[PDB]
Design a protein around this ligand. Structure first.
Ligand SMILES: CCCCc1ccc(C(=O)O)nc1
Ligand SMILES: CCCCc1ccc(C(=O)O)nc1
Ligand SMILES: CCCCc1ccc(C(=O)O)nc1
Lengths: 281, 281, 281
């Protein structure tokens, strides 16, 4: 199944017939960071299995739904579940849900993820507003856009210089200042490690030399598909650990430690994103 | 279809029966930079669709032909059309036309492309004689030679240290000096970005740190296939923009701006390559 | 064929019925560096073609066997043949033999390879104990673990910080000191170049900037599969040449030169690994 205009249109028509919500905001939440989706008002849950042309999501298993409703008086659509490229999904499978968001009317996409810190100023539990990226898969012929271009969505050769909207970053910071947590909020450059192995100690040292502030295994594919079709993006990393300090001290990382940091910041992040949604222009 | 000896031989036999030209020079011209192909004398046009085993080129659409004839008294074969890896073509599809050139008798391959400038000395409209490369796809397991080796063409483990012939670079520069445009001509290292997104501002800054002078989305696959089978190469980049200055100033790039630079230098480049062809040893 | 628990179990059951050896040590030897396999005592040779689910190894051709027996009073299993990713084998094909080693009882995996030197201190004929790596394929979405996770073997997100066991490196060095060849033995970081082209001169210069000591086209995939399932690893590179000196002097490299260095060090390496095997805890 190709992420083309006909296939996206069939999915969008189905969603419309079922939901009667026309969203202008989309959200994708990182693992352990999805409690906001549980508080959507007047919500309608649409499983991927019912949506024409959506990818199968039961080899990896676990959840896989679209949730439409209201937050802070705004009409939104949330992606629940996980579709990451380290799982073996194709370019076309990652792109189709974002292109359907476009056809439903989405103009702004908000994303959170879990990442490792590279910059020496970053502590476990800090937040990073992403201002740019280094896309190792893209440099290496695994860009999400490799394949025929789908002209109805965007151009053959997109420019990513404004992929991360500046005014959205400024609003996120303004809210942090209003609630006395700006000391936790930084800005920086996100390195995309295809994964699923964590960055090795020597890879972390390389990323420091190359000007990266954080590293993770998601987000950049969705950002590129959104930018290609004219959707504005805000992306925020939660820092699980500092990989440079861990390399210098011979300290390990694991998914359990990552999930405990997610639990420690889950309430703060949910409240922050609810306020961002409410105040978006 | 594999780029093997039998499949290449069948294509070569067809071309011979149709053309009665045995070329010793091949040319591949960048987008907007192909007017030279229109001035080939006594020309014969052979569409890919008629050549046994050649790849299909109608999903991307647009042109796709081989043109054989004379330029400056020399027998040449030109590739018209575009076969780039960001479009989804396989290793075997990119390699087959170059291996057919080898079987027809080609000893020298001349290539032009459009690229972004990384070195601070480079201005829009300048030319770069490529003296080496950094192949991000190759480091990352997407080299054009991944797969079984085709022993009739070359070795399992090729050396690329002489991929860009030094005497051909010197002749290109000599002609520039003779015609008072040497101030536009530089030498440098080409970074291969698989594409199709332009390099991000932070990727451009990384490439500066790593010793790259220019960046583009083509050329390196063809260079590697040519070097593997003993064909000498000259490759020249036309600089569309300086990506480091654009990153520092928050300035965008698009395919339209790139094509306007191609128009501004098209006549000069056509005249330069005609003289290179005439004077090749 | 997927490298899953059922398929690995069927292969392991076959091997057991044929061999009556339960090995706790596995070995993978680099090209020209396999004479040790010829001295295995009470050996049983099991060709891949007879083992349920093992990959086909006749396109590349040449040898392909498992050899079980005793060395220095220890029970071992050796992989004879070559399964490298530049040949076009899939993630699942590389991983299956290592996962079968796990099911047979292997706890330690010993690996040798041929590599190019980047650090200026390295001479042709030196040895490097690998202490970490930079995995360009992994950063670029070609990690050996891309795909569904096989939960019986290991976790979705492995940590590689202890992939290269420190005590095994210390034992290898102790034996070198006991036999007056420690002047040949270094430690360092291994860069994985997917291949099959040797690193270009400008790629070599980049790797120097990024903190790499050696570069090669193997080893990292097997290390990652072993680490994922709890097998300890020692990996040693034999240096064929110094690629930084060769770049500065305009000197070429070829597979013939590499194989002559392998011949020059083959006896020393065979004797070293026999003593390592004998003395493993
Ligand atoms: C009774 C139908 C529900 C079972 C089901 C749910 C989800 C998926 C999928 O997302 O791939 N497949 C099947
Ligand atoms: C009447 C036959 C010409 C139509 C045609 C031309 C080119 C191609 C191709 O290059 O894939 N396919 C079909
Ligand atoms: C008579 C059977 C032996 C011939 C044979 C040997 C090895 C392989 C392989 O490893 O793919 N295939 C076939």
């Amino acid at each position: 199944v190709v992420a083309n205009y006909e296939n996206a249109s069939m999915a969008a028509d189905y969603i419309k017939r079922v939901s009667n919500v026309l969203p202008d905001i989309g959200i994708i939440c990182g693992s352990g960071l999805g409690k906001l989706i549980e508080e959507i008002e007047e919500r309608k849950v649409i499983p991927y299995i019912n949506i024409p042309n959506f990818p199968k999501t039961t080899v990896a298993g676990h959840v896989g739904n679209l949730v439409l409703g209201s937050v802070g008086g705004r009409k939104i659509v949330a992606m629940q579940g996980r579709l990451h490229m380290y799982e073996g999904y194709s370019n076309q499978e990652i792109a189709l849900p974002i292109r359907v968001m476009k056809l439903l009317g989405v103009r702004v996409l908000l994303i959170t993820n879990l990442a490792g810190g590279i910059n020496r100023k970053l502590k476990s539990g800090d937040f990073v507003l992403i201002k740019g990226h280094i896309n190792f898969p893209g440099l290496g012929l695994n860009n999400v856009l490799v394949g025929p271009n789908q002209d109805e969505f965007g151009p053959r050769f997109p420019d990513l210089s404004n992929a991360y909207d500046r005014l959205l970053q400024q609003l996120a910071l303004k809210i942090a200042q209003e609630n006395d947590f700006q000391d936790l909020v930084h800005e920086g450059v996100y390195a995309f490690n295809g994964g699923p192995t964590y960055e090795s100690p020597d890879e972390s040292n390389m990323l420091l030399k190359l000007g990266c502030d954080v590293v993770g295994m998601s987000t950049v594919p969705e950002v590129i598909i959104a930018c290609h079709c004219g959707i504005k993006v805000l992306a925020v990393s939660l820092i699980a650990n500092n990989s440079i300090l861990d390399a210098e001290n011979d300290v390990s990382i694991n998914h359990e430690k990552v999930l405990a940091v997610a639990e420690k910041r889950a309430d703060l992040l949910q409240m922050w994103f609810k306020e961002i949604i409410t105040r978006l222009p």
